[PDB]
Ligand binder design. Structure first.
Ligand SMILES: [Cl-]
Lengths: 118, 121, 121
């Protein structure tokens, strides 16, 4: 099945840049946000958004730490039903461990394969 | 409001009751200012929203082009195409057509906002 | 007020607007306290004095025997000679006659004063 819901594992302008492309393609979008990003516009630009890094399921992760949590990102991808993740740039975009976790969850990693990265 | 649609709401400020019996709550909603007016029912303002309110359509309605306080009313029953009221911020609001005005909702040394209904033909 | 009749007037206190849209100015007049209520027209309370007001005459009128807040309303259209409302300060105001009540001016968790009109037969 072609990609129909993308979670952007990122924030700020790159997350918005990817939401725009996805929406233009008719693809659903999912944002993530740390508590510190509760007012960040990228989260209001996706079709739905979910907090990462805080809660009963943890300590509170730091502002940037929340976005580097492979476990949190995968949790929200499953929760939202995202079938692909775009890592944008920076953050987890060159983590083979992250690509591996995506592969394990059956979620498409939008970028090169894990072995390519290593 | 639904799953994945979380609003962040902050109470920034609450105004004094205004001359219309309305209190403005200045909210921040998802980071953006939103002003919401409600009647001050607590202080006896049930029956309140007060000032109409011009319809951009009709001809009929004399709507304020701008916010201010009215400085002079020049009319209360009909003529020409003539200064009807002035607004200080003085302008100088003219009748757009021939007619008989059948209502003057001002008033004034009254404060008004653009689109408030000033007079009706 | 006339030659040899000099009043001494002091503004002692001005209340917040109350639930009826009225402000109380507590004056001292010739050394004696006098409370005077006016509408808070400045905040949109033109149309205000609000609560009637029982006539000691008629039968007809259910007037509050005492000041308080109403705690329960037990009625809105007619019976017996029965608790109509209660007032907390709970009392316990009874119907004095047989009838059908045709108005309940309360209401309440409303504050009232002795003589306020509670209900009309
Ligand atoms: Cl951090």
């Amino acid at each position: 099945g072609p990609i129909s819901k993308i979670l952007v594992a990122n924030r700020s302008e790159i997350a918005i840049r990817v939401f725009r492309a996805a929406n233009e393609l008719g693809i659903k979008t999912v944002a993530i946000w740390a508590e510190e990003d509760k007012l960040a516009l990228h989260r209001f630009k996706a079709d739905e958004s979910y907090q990462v890094g805080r809660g009963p399921h943890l300590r509170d992760l730091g502002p940037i730490e929340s976005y580097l949590s492979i476990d949190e990102v995968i949790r929200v991808a499953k929760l939202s039903g995202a079938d692909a993740i775009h890592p944008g740039y920076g953050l987890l975009s060159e983590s083979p461990e992250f690509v591996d976790a995506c592969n394990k969850a059956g979620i498409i990693f939008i970028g090169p394969k894990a072995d390519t990265m290593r | 409001i639904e799953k994945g649609k979380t609003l962040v709401i902050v109470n920034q400020a609450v105004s004094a009751t205004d001359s219309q019996g309305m209190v403005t709550v200045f909210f921040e909603l998802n980071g953006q200012p939103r002003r919401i007016k409600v009647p001050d029912r607590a202080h006896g303002a049930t029956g309140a929203a007060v000032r109409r309110k011009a319809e951009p359509g009709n001809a009929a309605h004399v709507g304020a082009p701008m916010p201010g306080v009215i400085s002079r009313v020049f009319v209360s029953s009909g003529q020409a195409v003539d200064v009807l009221v002035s607004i200080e911020a003085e302008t100088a609001i003219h009748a757009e057509k021939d007619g008989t005005i059948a209502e003057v909702l001002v008033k004034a040394g009254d404060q008004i906002d653009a689109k408030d209904l000033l007079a009706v033909y």
